[PDB]
Amino acid sequence: RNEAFFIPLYELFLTYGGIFRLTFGPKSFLIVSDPSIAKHILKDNAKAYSKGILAEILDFVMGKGLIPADGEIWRRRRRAIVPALHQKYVAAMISLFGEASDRLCQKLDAAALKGEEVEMESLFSRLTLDIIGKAVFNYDFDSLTNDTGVIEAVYTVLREAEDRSVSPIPVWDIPIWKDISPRQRKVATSLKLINDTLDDLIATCKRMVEEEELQFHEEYMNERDPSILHFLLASGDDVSSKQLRDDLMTMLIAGHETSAAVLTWTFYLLTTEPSVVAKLQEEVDSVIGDRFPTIQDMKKLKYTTRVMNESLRLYPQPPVLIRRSIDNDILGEYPIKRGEDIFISVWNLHRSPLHWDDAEKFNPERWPLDGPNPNETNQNFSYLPFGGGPRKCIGDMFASFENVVAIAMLIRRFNFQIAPGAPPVKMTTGATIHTTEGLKLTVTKRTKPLDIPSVPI
Amino acid sequence: NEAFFIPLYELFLTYGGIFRLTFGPKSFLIVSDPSIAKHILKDNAKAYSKGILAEILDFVMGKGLIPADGEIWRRRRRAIVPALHQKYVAAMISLFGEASDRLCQKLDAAALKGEEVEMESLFSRLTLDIIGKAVFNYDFDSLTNDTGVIEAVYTVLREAEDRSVSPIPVWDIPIWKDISPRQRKVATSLKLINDTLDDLIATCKRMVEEEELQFHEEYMNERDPSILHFLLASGDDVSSKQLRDDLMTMLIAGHETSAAVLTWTFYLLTTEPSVVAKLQEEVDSVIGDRFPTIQDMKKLKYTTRVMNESLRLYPQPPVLIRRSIDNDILGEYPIKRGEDIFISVWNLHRSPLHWDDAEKFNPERWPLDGPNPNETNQNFSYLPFGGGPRKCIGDMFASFENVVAIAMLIRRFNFQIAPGAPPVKMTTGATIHTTEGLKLTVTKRTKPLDIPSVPIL
Ligand code: HEM
Numbered sequence: 001r002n003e004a005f006f007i008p009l010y011e012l013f014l015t016y017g018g019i020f021r022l023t024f025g026p027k028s029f030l031i032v033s034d035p036s037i038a039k040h041i042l043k044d045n046a047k048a049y050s051k052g053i054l055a056e057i058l059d060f061v062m063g064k065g066l067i068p069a070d071g072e073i074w075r076r077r078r079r080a081i082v083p084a085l086h087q088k089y090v091a092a093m094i095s096l097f098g099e100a101s102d103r104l105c106q107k108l109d110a111a112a113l114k115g116e117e118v119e120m121e122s123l124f125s126r127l128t129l130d131i132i133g134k135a136v137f138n139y140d141f142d143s144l145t146n147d148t149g150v151i152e153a154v155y156t157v158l159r160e161a162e163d164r165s166v167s168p169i170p171v172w173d174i175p176i177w178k179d180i181s182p183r184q185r186k187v188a189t190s191l192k193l194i195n196d197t198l199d200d201l202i203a204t205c206k207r208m209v210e211e212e213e214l215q216f217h218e219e220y221m222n223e224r225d226p227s228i229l230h231f232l233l234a235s236g237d238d239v240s241s242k243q244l245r246d247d248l249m250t251m252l253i254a255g256h257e258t259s260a261a262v263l264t265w266t267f268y269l270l271t272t273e274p275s276v277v278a279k280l281q282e283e284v285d286s287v288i289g290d291r292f293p294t295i296q297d298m299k300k301l302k303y304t305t306r307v308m309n310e311s312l313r314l315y316p317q318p319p320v321l322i323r324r325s326i327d328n329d330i331l332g333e334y335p336i337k338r339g340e341d342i343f344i345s346v347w348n349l350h351r352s353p354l355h356w357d358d359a360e361k362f363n364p365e366r367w368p369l370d371g372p373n374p375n376e377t378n379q380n381f382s383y384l385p386f387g388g389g390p391r392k393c394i395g396d397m398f399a400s401f402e403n404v405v406a407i408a409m410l411i412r413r414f415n416f417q418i419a420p421g422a423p424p425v426k427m428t429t430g431a432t433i434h435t436t437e438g439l440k441l442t443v444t445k446r447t448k449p450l451d452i453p454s455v456p457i
Numbered sequence: 458n459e460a461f462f463i464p465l466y467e468l469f470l471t472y473g474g475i476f477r478l479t480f481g482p483k484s485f486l487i488v489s490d491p492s493i494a495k496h497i498l499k500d501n502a503k504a505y506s507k508g509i510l511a512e513i514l515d516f517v518m519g520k521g522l523i524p525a526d527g528e529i530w531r532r533r534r535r536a537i538v539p540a541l542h543q544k545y546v547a548a549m550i551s552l553f554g555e556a557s558d559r560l561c562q563k564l565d566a567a568a569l570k571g572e573e574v575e576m577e578s579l580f581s582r583l584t585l586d587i588i589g590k591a592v593f594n595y596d597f598d599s600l601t602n603d604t605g606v607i608e609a610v611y612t613v614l615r616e617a618e619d620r621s622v623s624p625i626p627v628w629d630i631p632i633w634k635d636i637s638p639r640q641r642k643v644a645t646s647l648k649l650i651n652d653t654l655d656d657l658i659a660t661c662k663r664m665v666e667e668e669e670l671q672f673h674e675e676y677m678n679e680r681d682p683s684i685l686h687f688l689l690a691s692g693d694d695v696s697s698k699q700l701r702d703d704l705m706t707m708l709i710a711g712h713e714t715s716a717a718v719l720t721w722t723f724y725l726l727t728t729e730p731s732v733v734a735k736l737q738e739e740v741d742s743v744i745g746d747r748f749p750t751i752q753d754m755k756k757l758k759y760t761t762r763v764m765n766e767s768l769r770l771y772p773q774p775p776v777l778i779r780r781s782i783d784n785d786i787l788g789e790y791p792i793k794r795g796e797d798i799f800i801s802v803w804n805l806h807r808s809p810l811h812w813d814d815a816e817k818f819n820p821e822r823w824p825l826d827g828p829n830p831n832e833t834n835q836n837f838s839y840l841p842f843g844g845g846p847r848k849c850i851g852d853m854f855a856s857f858e859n860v861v862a863i864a865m866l867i868r869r870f871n872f873q874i875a876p877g878a879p880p881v882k883m884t885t886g887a888t889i890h891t892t893e894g895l896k897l898t899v900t901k902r903t904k905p906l907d908i909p910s911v912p913i914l
């Protein structure tokens with residue numbers, strides 16, 4: 001169809017190797033699928049690269065215009081935000097993960113009783129939105145149940161950004177010159193709605209901070225408002241309201257669809273291997289049963305963690321990392337000048353036959369169950385679930401626990417199967433990998449071990 | 458590939474004078490009915506804006522994405538129109554004369570070396586040299602030279618034509634990634650043009666202060682008869698930015714339009730030798746080698762018809778873009794606000810239902826001594842200069858410009874399609890360009906009353 005462009009890039013990769021140039025007219029793109037070269041760009045010589053095309057496109061959509069900002073502004077804000085995601089914060093977020101997942105479970109119980117089919121991708125999107133809003137700026141979207149102005153303003157921003165997501169493979173369409181004016185206006189309206197909502201949250205929290213008798217420190221957390229926003233305001237760092245709003249927006253977007261896609265593809269993947277569902281159930285039944293998981297449970301949910309590890313391998317979010325050279329460099333042996341637009345295919349890295357045995361196989365036990373958890377260091381940049389180098393994910397522990405909690409709880413409560421006559425599960429791509437027409441599943445209440453024998457009348 | 462108006466012609470033959478073209482969630486109304494076009498363009502013009510075309514043009518020209526108050530232009534149009542009075546147009550005939558003669562000198566040289574000429578390019582230079590002088594008293598000398606400012610004009614032109622809207626999809630990578638650099642490159646060219654305009658304004662402001670002439674409807678400083686001078690002598694309170702914009706508007710409006718008319722006229726002439734004969738016969742008789750004067754204009758009847766007929770077969774532009782800004786009825790069909798409309802002038806001009814032998818180059822389809830054809834005359838089946846409140850203000854200027862140019866060239870030279878010349882095909886935008894140029898063979902014409910000539914052995 002209008003295939004996810006990383007599929008053609010995979011085929012081209014098998015032929016042409018870990019670095020090749022894609023030419024189309026007077027413009028070209030470098031496609032990097034070599035772990036060493038990816039490590040060079042992302043980590044060893046990261047300072048020679050910007051986010052190029054992706055940054056420019058994203059800035060335009062978000063109202064920041066066509067002038068690339070000083071990169072040191074973000075480096076500064078990132079340094080300020082990272083400490084907010086400390087050990088104690090992540091532990092407190094586990095509770096939020098549990099209750100939010102339970103709300104989804106309530107929705108699933110209802111659908112199961114009525115024997116209805118569910119579209120899981122949509123539901124995972126609502127769940128993770130509710131989580132990130134609460135976690136980041138202490139707001140309850142309640143998108144699992146409602147569709148409000150701000151909820152719709154978020155998805156309008158999302159849909160628009162994804163529609164502008166860059167692909168080096170030409171498609172059949174009318175140029176969008178005619179569309180710039182109306183699209184930017186519609187988006188601007190949605191952004192103002194979100195920003196006004198954020199403004200009310202900033203003000204509310206500033207007030208809570210002034211009235212506090214708490215010393216700020218690296219492990220600071222007001223227990224009544226443990227959000228990142230609260231941490232940032234208790235810091236005393238001088239930041240404009242515009243910048244702070246922009247930061248909250250960044251993490252909302254970074255932390256929403258990412259986890260939703262990971263849950264979606266994990267559950268798709270689970271349908272393809274019943275024996276994996278078996279091991280998963282066995283662990284969850286033993287370790288947590290019906291309990292909301294706690295920080296101590298995370299170490300013990302080993303097989304669940306690996307399932308997530310393996311899902312992110314087969315379906316990376318995003319499947320491509322965009323860069324642009326801003327200085328001279330050598331990629332392997334190949335000299336390059338400033339101005340090269342580069343696509344690092346995480347999809348190719350993760351599924352490379354040269355670096356993975358049975359690359360297309362869903363096998364959570366390809367990394368020893370009791371060994372170390374796989375990461376970009378571990379796997380020599382053949383595995384990049386959370387990126388690598390200075391621009392890597394800052395929500396990686398947050399998101400790992402979020403998804404382990406969600407998977408574990410759901411797998412405890414329900415049996416999931418591909419619905420009869422459900423649409424085929426195909427991919428579209430952007431910031432994350434979406435399904436083409438949803439993930440339609442049959443959900444039934446699971447008969448748990450140690451259930452009391454039941455007898456209908 | 459094809460100029461999109463070609464498929465719209467075929468669709469028009471099937472579906473008639475008004476139909477909806479659908480592609481996804483968006484659609485365009487294609488109007489080819491003279492009555493409906495008269496309704497939109499004239500009778501109920503107030504229910505329509507220039508929609509997509511205006512938005513696309515505003516962006517490229519540095520005016521952003523919020524449409525200005527339409528009343529601003531209506532005000533400025535009222536101020537500019539009086540500048541193109543009878544006395545002014547007469548004085549421009551001299552300029553038309555001398556510029557065409559300069560092209561003739563270039564053509565004389567090429568004939569001597571037996572070189573082939575690419576006429577579209579040369580007509581573009583000719584009309585650029587004419588419009589710059591007539592509008593803001595500047596000599597581009599593009600017929601002889603290549604400067605930065607000349608290149609800045611064509612850089613703007615090329616970009617605008619590349620963004621010109623087509624309702625028919627093409628095969629390409631979306632240009633979201635290119636918005637920032639394109640906007641920047643153009644802005645650089647625009648600044649160069651604007652700085653030149655600023656210097657011209659200043660020179661003229663001083664010349665106006667030190668002159669002792671009363672302003673009136675027939676005002677014209679004989680030393681600087683340009684439109685710019687008239688506007689400054691008016692006393693109209695207008696900002697420099699606005700004035701610059703007006704000069705840009707007319708530069709663009711009066712440049713490529715005439716070039717395309719000359720280009721397609723000369724293409725058409727190669728297709729009908731008997732028309733060239735009649736043309737030569739008239740020109741030999743009426744003006745000979747003389748530069749035409751205002752009095753010659755009435756007498757150059759067949760030349761006028763050749764131009765009339767060229768504009769019929771190759772309208773500039775081939776489509777007029779509108780958008781409904783109120784409710785309306787198009788024929789019988791009810792319409793809401795927000796409809797994007799393409800009036801196909803190409804279809805109107807070539808409709809078999811309204812023209813006998815519509816594809817035939819026949820300057821005598823309007824009786825030679827009858828009235829000159831116009832939008833009133835032809836009941837909106839003929840729109841060389843548009844119609845209604847947004848119609849061309851340079852229509853008399855341009856009609857004389859082209860008659861002068863055609864007449865002189867046909868007096869002096871024989872033109873033929875060059876051997877092995879590229880095929881003449883069409884691309885489209887604000888005007889109809891050829892795909893690969895109009896390569897012609899040019900030889901000095903043996904005129905009646907030429908002294909018998911004998912080359913030396
Ligand atoms: C399964 C969930 C997630 C995945 C797979 C993921 C993945 C990634 C990846 C691969 C990058 C690097 C992109 C690049 O280098 O171009 C990134 C960046 C980032 N992530 Fe995540 N992420 C997830 C969840 C989160 C969460 C929950 C947060 C915050 C609470 C977050 C915050 C960020 C931020 C702020 C960046 C930009 C860092 C920078 O540019 O310096 N992410 N993410």
Ligand code: HEM
Nearest residue numbers: 707710711714715718773777842843847848849850851855
């Ligand atoms: C053969 C040459 C020309 C042709 C075929 C032509 C054709 C047209 C047409 C069809 C329109 C109306 C477009 C629409 O309604 O969307 C128009 C508008 C206009 N023309 Fe011309 N034109 C020519 C030369 C000129 C010249 C020489 C000038 C000025 C010196 C000029 C100034 C303008 C202006 C300012 C407008 C905009 C009117 C408005 O929006 O109210 N044009 N032209």
